[model samples]
Target: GDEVVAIISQNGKVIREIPLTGHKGNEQFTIKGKGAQYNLMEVDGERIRIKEDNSPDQVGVKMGWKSKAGDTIVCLPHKVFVEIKST
Candidate 1:
């Protein structure tokens, strides 16, 4: 049951496809495209959260998941998307 991945996309390109268990408790990684940047926060091996983002237009919620399959976090202004899935 230790199978989970988070697909991070920027401007329609897949940038980071990370396994949740491998990145647990890691912090402060950057995924950027031109004027947009995102920082990641993974905690307790049970969550994937986008803690920081740089964009003029903010969305209603941040992209984070409690290791749940089919959960997504998106940033409209930057065209950034994150999807969680189980394998």
Candidate 2:
């Protein structure tokens, strides 16, 4: 089993921790950010999928990551961020 952790945060504060076993090729979830709902998903082989466009804008953003060290995904407009750990 692969070991991966999803760290989600907002407003420069740590909020939730998700331990992903790289098992969900068909999995997704939402975390409460500073202002709205955010999306987090698991892709192939210990990877994460995120929705950057959490706002109501037509052209928007996304926030996702992978199971590797020094990996970070940021939703600049939303002030939301996602990071991955381990390789």
Error of 1 at 25 (Å): 2.5
TM-score of every prediction relative to native: 0.72, 0.57
Residue 30 in model 1: shift from native, Å?
Answer: 1.4
RMSD of 1: 2.8
Quote the positional error of residue 79 for candidate 1 in Å: 1.1
Q: In candidate 1, which residue ranges exceed 4 Å CA deviation?
A: 36-44, 60-65
lDDT of 2 by residue, 17-74 (tens): 6665645555555655555555443455466656434555412233334566566776
Q: Whole-model lDDT, candidate 1?
A: 0.66
Where is model 2 more than 4 Å wrong at Cα?
32-45, 55-65
By TM-score, who's the top model here? 1
RMSD per model, one decimal: 2.8, 4.1
lDDT, candidate 2, equals: 0.57
Shift in Å, residue 80, candidate 1? 0.9
